[PDB]
RNA sequence: UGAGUGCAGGGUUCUAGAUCUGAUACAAGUCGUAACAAGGCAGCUGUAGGAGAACCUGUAGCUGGAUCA
RNA sequence: CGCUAGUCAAGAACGAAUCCGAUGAUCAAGGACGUAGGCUGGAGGAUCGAAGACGAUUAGAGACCGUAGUAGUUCCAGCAGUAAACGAUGCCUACGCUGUUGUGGUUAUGAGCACGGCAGAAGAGAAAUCUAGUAGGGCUUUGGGGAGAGUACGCGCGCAA
RNA sequence: ACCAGGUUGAUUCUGCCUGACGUGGAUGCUAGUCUCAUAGAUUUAGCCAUGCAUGUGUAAGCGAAGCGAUUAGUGAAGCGGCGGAAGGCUCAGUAACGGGCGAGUAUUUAAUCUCUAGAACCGGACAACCUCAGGAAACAGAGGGGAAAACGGAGUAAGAGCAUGUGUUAGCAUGUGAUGAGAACAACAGUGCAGGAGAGUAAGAAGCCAUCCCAUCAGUUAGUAAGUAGGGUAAGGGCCUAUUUAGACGUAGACGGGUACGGGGGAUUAGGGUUUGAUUCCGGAGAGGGAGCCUGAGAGACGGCUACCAGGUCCAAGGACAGCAGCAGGCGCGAAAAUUACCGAAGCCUCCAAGAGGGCGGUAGUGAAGAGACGUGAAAACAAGUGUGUGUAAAAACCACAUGAGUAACUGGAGGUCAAGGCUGGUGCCAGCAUCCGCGGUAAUACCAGCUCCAGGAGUGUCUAUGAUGAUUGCUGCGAUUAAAAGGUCCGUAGUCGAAGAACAGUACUUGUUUGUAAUGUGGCUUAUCGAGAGCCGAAUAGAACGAGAAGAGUUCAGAG
């Protein structure tokens, strides 16, 4: 039926590619993943970044180049994913910059989701009881709990992150 | 008078044009009486119905073009 | 009812049309009036968005204008002599628009005499007024507006239209 | 259709009255009157969002059964009533006096004046004619009529009204250097100068413009307003006086230009 | 029911002709192919029994559910 | 202005029918053995006769022939 | 399409300082020709020989082989419209390596132009081989896994086949 | 922007079958929590029990009976006024004014706006009321009063058309004239109604351009094509009729037949494409099938009327009534689709209204059609429960605090394609399995079971259409010596295609400016714990208006051949 809400994962075109079977099977692993539907629906997510630089690098007018160059680089800069000193108003570094993005991978989107930055932060001995405090509400953040390991969170927000005791 | 216009139609997919024509059926006037004829262009003015197929009427024309009946030189040069 | 819609219509190649409607209201027709020559009688239509039109089913008198003198005078009228369309319509006396009528002259007879020119001017129309022959052309429409008005042939209307009466 | 549309759905309704697409299905058909249904729009919305006093449909009855809303110098007790652009709104308690002008998006809103702007309004001149026991008359884009009025005015011009006596003011012509404010088009909500009219035949003129802070743009008569006489402004314009900046443009304010 | 045809039909499983008795209404079903052909070794059969009296065949074989009776 | 209904015809789509005649599948039934080796008369294309049946015979052609001579 | 003379029209190629100036390429519909065998009428009838009849050979031969024998095989006036009608390679127009051998004209005797054969090479192609090399030049015909099927129904031509 | 298995004793090719992946319906087995969408379209535009979906009154049109009164009052039966032509449902018919873009006439328009704008007399009835009183019911009679801003007449303003001057063209002058009206009331301090001229809204008719399959359908048409004159209409017009002229349309596919609600849009997709659109927006048509119609500003109306045909319902047998392609609901038909639920609240529409009405609309219930976020433990310490508050029209859910606690996985597979066992026991070409290739004749990693593994996971298998696979439909981009495939040879029309040199012109061609897109989609930003979601911004297709450039295309010339 068609109706509301989009669809945020693609299916791999070969089900029993044992390459990518076994590379998948490491990295749901060591992150601590629910199942492939979290893996797959981050890729969609690192893809769609690739899709625009791609459209930039070729773009034949200028107007469009310099206005959106700069949104592209400040949205990934706030949510803490490309790190690196992109000076604005000098061409040549927008084009060194976008051409930086084109081998950005998975890896440093997971690195950004709650789950991990608890245990980063050592706040819990492993990225599983780092989960299981997602849930039952020992995590909070600005004073106020959030139950979704999902949660991807912004650059120096990691200030303001938390643990409390169990309530028996 | 029937009068036909001619004009191309592009066909996307091959990415080539046909050739199109529409007739139109137009009051001529007594005023124009020996002056228009078979192959002549003309321009017509739109106006209220005439009657079931009739709707322009000819308000004049462009005459098929001779250039020159070229010259004859004299025989006595 | 009498439809004006071109719904039954052949296309302009000859083909025929399929109906994809019932009839409507707002293309609806209505029988001719056939104004006779009579006592009057002349009855009100109700028409589209409340307004009234005026049908004259017989008629005994016009109105009638004299063109060079600039005048109108009120006359009797007797009978079609002639009519464009139809042979028909002149042998059981139908009054229309550009039908040819003979009239009551005495009224036209009085004012034109006033003119010493008048002789001179028009001799044709001058005989016929003598011989008490008036002949006029009704310019309104009967069946529309309730009433016959027209004007008094002079000139060279009277040497074309007299020669379509003669046998 | 057996006869005359009475609904509108939400969908369907004005892009310049600015209503949220999800809240119901229907929005409010505006009754016949002054300006056209596509160049105006209905007290109600004006009351309940443009200009906030009433939060429900009892409320916008109660106020309007009170009698205490004013448009034109008359009161008004039709909610369906349409507002058009130039069209002074008051409420006499509290002695308070607000125009109809676009936003710079072409959006409607409501900006507030003194008691001395809000005695006059402007309209453009449409029709000419002589009427029964040989009267002069004059009409005006938003159903306006005229009698005696100065006989020179001429079709296309623009007038100044005085809401109290009815009666024309002031008149200006459409000429090289004059202000004039855009109504329709790309370029709704902008105000700007008279460079050059180009003259076309059976057809409409066409008219180039300049912005205050540097801009060109042209557009056909049809969408212009003339709205002084010669130099600078009638009315008083909007808290930002009618510069449109694109995307690109406010990057560049914003973030600096490109360096060499 | 549909056509007032009469067609030849295949019984699935192990001992699937025991689950049906002369005049049960059956529901049929498509071998799976792109015209309506033949598949394997059966000469000429076009269609498959599907359920019996309302219930799945699969259920009825292998003794999940019983006949409505 | 016309609904309905008489009587003849057509145009479409389905369906019945004594009997005849094709095709396809027939584990392996009966009679021969026509083709593939110079397959035991080299094969094949057109046309015309004939014949339980494959096929056989006259006439013109072709090599994809058993001969690049 | 193959004996010799005489006669009657038109065509191809070659030589060259003749004339006209875009008149051209390809082609549904429509029209003309088309080996052999066949058919309608006339002439004729040597040789060969479908059908038919015998003699042998074989389990059986109705066939192959031998004896005999008719329609046809020839000519004039027509109908018909199929072939392994094949170099199984559409028609115009290009760009393209060498050696050798023909046929007809012309020649500074060095060569050319039109129509061919042959042998390598380089490229090409699944190979065999090359009318198949290079290529978004123009226009028409035409195929889309085997079978059923070039068959059924309708239609057009033909005396019939 | 991608491949794999299958003709042979092996090999290299042509070629098709099958697997692997999206999406629309149907279905097996299994199912913890919360949020956003959507549901008798496909078959029968088949048939329908019941209940509801359209009515409205003020200080201010007329006011009967009753009640009551020092000649007051009341409180309202009917009449009048305004609406019932919108919205809701469906896709039968239509190859067409059905669809996109421009333009504003040859037209009519209750309400509403601006300017302007009204000295008028007389008479009956109809309904309700009162007295009889019919009929099985549905529905009606006699007789007698009496109102209006209801109705008909009188005068009177006004006044269509016709003719001539003058200003196209209003207007004005003059002659002639059919027709022929009109509302006030209340003071809580206002509300109405007559005439004009211009707007505003809505239709009717028109201009241009685009539109499906069959040639085993090649000729079609005679109101057909046109002219003159008249009738008719709100209005142009063969729209209709009389006499004259023979036209109009076709191989660039006419005419006939089959099929179809049309767009904005949806699915797939590197690009070029291929498929679909009953279905939130716009426009069209219908109300069992056909046809006629009154009232009105507006209907050829069906929750109006009338007749036939097909079907029904009640009767006292004489007659009456009725139409769910509105909302619930029932029966059938099918492989196929929810509650005879609550609603002084949100968004809007209707009236004579500080109020009344609305199954239009909103709120929940039901169902693994679709789409988000999360449970099923941790190494010290874990959903779902419950109670208060909130929330709402009232609710439930959601969220806050406080109490208990310790519950929570299945579907398809394991010989190759294709991830994962020559494990143990039965069966012996049986019974079965297997999209394809193939297994089983007593030593079965393939059947039937046990046990361990694999894959996805609140989900997974199957059937059926379609897009991709596929350069197996080829514009980009395939083939025709032998695999399937160049007409036996010429002539030839329609069609498609056509030198050099010197000049010329602007309709195609390309491009500027301006128009042309609500939703959806595209580029963004901001707020619901997060993420779909919601809210605001920017640009945009095809199509049209006006300019510009002249290479290619086009037209002409001859001291060129």
Same mark, same amino acid.
């Given at each position: 039926?068609?109706?509301?809400?989009?669809?945020?994962?693609?299916?791999?075109?070969?089900?029993?590619?044992?390459?990518?079977?076994?590379?998948?099977?490491?990295?749901?692993?060591?992150?601590?993943?629910?199942?492939?539907?979290?893996?797959?629906?981050?890729?969609?997510?690192?893809?769609?970044?690739?899709?625009?630089?791609?459209?930039?690098?070729?773009?034949?007018?200028?107007?469009?180049?310099?206005?959106?160059?700069?949104?592209?680089?400040?949205?990934?800069?706030?949510?803490?994913?490309?790190?690196?000193?992109?000076?604005?108003?000098?061409?040549?570094?927008?084009?060194?910059?976008?051409?930086?993005?084109?081998?950005?991978?998975?890896?440093?989107?997971?690195?950004?989701?709650?789950?991990?930055?608890?245990?980063?932060?050592?706040?819990?001995?492993?990225?599983?009881?780092?989960?299981?405090?997602?849930?039952?509400?020992?995590?909070?953040?600005?004073?106020?709990?959030?139950?979704?390991?999902?949660?991807?969170?912004?650059?120096?927000?990691?200030?303001?992150?938390?643990?409390?005791?169990?309530?028996? | 008078?029937?009068?036909?216009?001619?004009?191309?139609?592009?066909?996307?997919?091959?990415?080539?044009?046909?050739?199109?024509?529409?007739?139109?059926?137009?009051?001529?006037?007594?005023?124009?009486?020996?002056?228009?004829?078979?192959?002549?262009?003309?321009?017509?003015?739109?106006?209220?119905?005439?009657?079931?197929?009739?709707?322009?009427?000819?308000?004049?024309?462009?005459?098929?073009?001779?250039?020159?009946?070229?010259?004859?030189?004299?025989?006595?040069? | 009812?009498?439809?004006?819609?071109?719904?039954?219509?052949?296309?302009?190649?000859?083909?025929?049309?399929?109906?994809?409607?019932?009839?409507?209201?707002? $293309?609806?027709?209505?029988?001719?009036?056939?104004?006779?020559?009579?006592?009057?009688?002349?009855?009100?239509?109700?028409?589209?968005?409340? $307004?009234?039109?005026?049908?004259?089913?017989?008629?005994?008198?016009?109105?009638?204008?004299?063109?060079?003198?600039?005048?109108?005078?009120?006359?009797?009228?007797?009978?079609?002599?002639?009519?464009?369309?139809? $042979?028909?319509?002149?042998?059981?006396?139908?009054?229309?628009?550009?039908?040819?009528?003979?009239?009551?002259?005495?009224?036209?007879?009085?004012?034109?005499?006033?003119?010493?020119?008048?002789?001179?001017?028009?001799?044709?129309?001058?005989?016929?007024?003598?011989?008490? $022959?008036?002949?006029?052309?009704?310019?309104?429409?009967?069946?529309?507006?309730?009433?016959?008005?027209?004007?008094?042939?002079?000139?060279?209307?009277?040497?074309?239209?007299?020669?379509?009466?003669?046998? | 259709?057996?006869?005359?549309?009475?609904?509108?759905?939400?969908?369907?309704?004005?892009?310049?009255?600015?209503?949220?697409?999800?809240?119901?299905?229907?929005?409010?058909?505006?009754?016949?009157?002054?300006?056209?249904?596509? =160049?105006?729009?209905?007290?109600?919305?004006?009351?309940?969002?443009?200009?906030?006093?009433?939060?429900?449909?009892? =409320?916008?009855?109660?106020?309007?059964?009170?009698?205490?809303?004013?448009?034109?110098?008359?009161?008004?007790?039709?909610?369906?009533?349409?507002?058009?652009?130039?069209?002074?709104?008051?409420?006499?308690?509290?002695?308070?006096?607000?125009?109809?002008?676009?936003?710079?998006?072409?959006?409607?809103?409501?900006?507030?004046?003194? =008691?001395?702007?809000?005695?006059?309004?402007?309209?453009?001149?449409?029709?000419?004619?002589?009427?029964?026991?040989?009267?002069?008359?004059?009409?005006?884009?938003?159903?306006?009529?005229?009698?005696?009025?100065?006989?020179?005015?001429?079709?296309?011009?623009?007038?100044?009204?005085?809401?109290?006596?009815?009666?024309?003011? =002031?008149?200006?012509?459409?000429?090289?250097?004059?202000?004039?404010?855009?109504?329709?088009?790309?370029?709704?909500?902008?105000?700007?100068?008279?460079?050059?009219?180009?003259?076309?035949?059976?057809?409409?003129?066409?008219?180039?413009?300049?912005?205050?802070?540097?801009?060109?743009?042209?557009?056909?008569?049809?969408?212009?307003?003339?709205?002084?006489?010669?130099?600078?402004?009638?009315?008083?314009?909007?808290?930002?006086?009618?510069?449109?900046?694109?995307?690109?443009?406010?990057?560049?304010?914003?973030?600096?230009?490109?360096?060499? | 029911?549909?056509?007032? %045809?009469? *067609?030849?039909?295949?019984?699935?499983?192990?001992?699937?002709?025991?689950?049906?008795?002369?005049?049960?209404? *059956?529901?049929?079903?498509?071998?799976? %192919?792109?015209?309506?052909?033949?598949?394997?070794?059966?000469?000429?059969?076009?269609?498959?029994?599907?359920?019996?009296?309302?219930?799945?065949?699969?259920?009825?074989?292998?003794?999940?559910?019983?006949?409505?009776?």
């Amino acid at each position: 039926v068609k109706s509301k809400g989009i669809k945020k994962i693609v299916v791999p075109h070969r089900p029993f590619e044992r390459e990518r079977l076994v590379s998948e099977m490491y990295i749901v692993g060591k992150y601590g993943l629910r199942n492939k539907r979290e893996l797959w629906t981050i890729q969609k997510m690192c893809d769609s970044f690739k899709l625009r630089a791609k459209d930039l690098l070729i773009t034949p007018d200028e107007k469009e180049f310099t206005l959106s160059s700069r949104r592209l680089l400040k949205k990934l800069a706030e949510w803490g994913v490309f790190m690196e000193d992109v000076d604005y108003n000098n061409k040549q570094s927008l084009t060194n910059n976008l051409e930086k993005l084109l081998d950005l991978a998975p890896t440093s989107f997971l690195e950004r989701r709650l789950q991990h930055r608890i245990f980063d932060l050592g706040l819990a001995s492993s990225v599983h009881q780092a989960r299981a405090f997602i849930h039952a509400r020992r995590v909070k953040i600005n004073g106020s709990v959030v139950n979704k390991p999902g949660y991807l969170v912004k650059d120096g927000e990691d200030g303001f992150i938390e643990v409390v005791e169990s309530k028996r | 008078i029937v009068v036909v216009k001619r004009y191309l139609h592009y066909v996307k997919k091959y990415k080539r044009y046909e050739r199109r024509y529409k007739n139109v059926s137009v009051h001529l006037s007594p005023c124009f009486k020996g002056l228009v004829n078979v192959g002549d262009t003309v321009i017509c003015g739109e106006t209220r119905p005439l009657s079931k197929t009739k709707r322009f009427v000819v308000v004049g024309f462009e005459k098929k073009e001779i250039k020159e009946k070229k010259l004859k030189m004299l025989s006595e040069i | 009812g009498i439809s004006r819609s071109n719904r039954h219509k052949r296309k302009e190649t000859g083909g025929k049309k399929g109906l994809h409607e019932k009839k409507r209201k707002n $293309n609806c027709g209505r029988p001719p009036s056939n104004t006779r020559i009579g006592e009057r009688r002349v009855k009100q239509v109700r028409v589209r968005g409340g $307004n009234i039109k005026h049908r004259a089913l017989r008629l005994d008198t016009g109105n009638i204008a004299c063109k060079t003198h600039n005048f109108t005078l009120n006359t009797s009228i007797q009978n079609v002599m002639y009519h464009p369309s139809n $042979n028909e319509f002149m042998r059981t006396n139908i009054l229309t628009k550009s039908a040819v009528v003979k009239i009551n002259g005495q009224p036209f007879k009085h004012e034109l005499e006033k003119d010493q020119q008048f002789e001179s001017k028009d001799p044709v129309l001058f005989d016929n007024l003598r011989k008490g $022959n008036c002949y006029a052309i009704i310019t309104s429409r009967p069946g529309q507006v309730g009433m016959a008005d027209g004007y008094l042939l002079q000139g060279e209307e009277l040497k074309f239209y007299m020669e379509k009466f003669k046998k | 259709v057996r006869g005359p549309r009475k609904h509108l759905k939400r969908l369907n309704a004005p892009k310049s009255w600015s209503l949220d697409k999800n809240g119901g299905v229907f929005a409010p058909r505006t009754s016949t009157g002054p300006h056209s249904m596509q =160049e105006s729009i209905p007290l109600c919305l004006l009351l309940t969002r443009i200009l906030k006093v009433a939060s429900n449909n009892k =409320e916008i009855k109660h106020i309007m059964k009170n009698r205490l809303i004013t448009v034109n110098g008359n009161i008004r007790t039709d909610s369906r009533y349409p507002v058009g652009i130039m069209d002074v709104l008051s409420i006499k308690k509290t002695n308070e006096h607000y125009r109809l002008l676009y936003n710079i998006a072409g959006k409607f809103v409501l900006h507030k004046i003194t =008691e001395e702007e809000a005695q006059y309004r402007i309209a453009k001149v449409t029709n000419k004619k002589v009427v029964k026991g040989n009267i002069p008359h004059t009409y005006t884009s938003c159903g306006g009529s005229f009698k005696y009025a100065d006989p020179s005015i001429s079709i296309g011009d623009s007038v100044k009204i005085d809401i109290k006596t009815s009666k024309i003011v =002031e008149n200006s012509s459409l000429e090289v250097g004059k202000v004039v404010y855009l109504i329709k088009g790309k370029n709704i909500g902008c105000l700007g100068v008279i460079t050059g009219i180009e003259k076309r035949e059976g057809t409409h003129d066409i008219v180039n413009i300049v912005d205050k802070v540097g801009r060109n743009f042209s557009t056909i008569f049809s969408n212009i307003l003339v709205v002084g006489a010669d130099d600078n402004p009638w009315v008083t314009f909007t808290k930002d006086e009618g510069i449109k900046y694109s995307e690109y443009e406010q990057s560049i304010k914003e973030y600096g230009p490109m360096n060499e | 029911v549909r056509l007032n %045809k009469k *067609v030849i039909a295949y019984v699935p499983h192990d001992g699937g002709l025991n689950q049906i008795e002369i005049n049960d209404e *059956v529901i049929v079903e498509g071998l799976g %192919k792109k015209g309506c052909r033949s598949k394997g070794d059966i000469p000429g059969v076009r269609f498959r029994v599907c359920k019996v009296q309302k219930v799945s065949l699969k259920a009825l074989v292998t003794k999940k559910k019983e006949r409505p009776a």
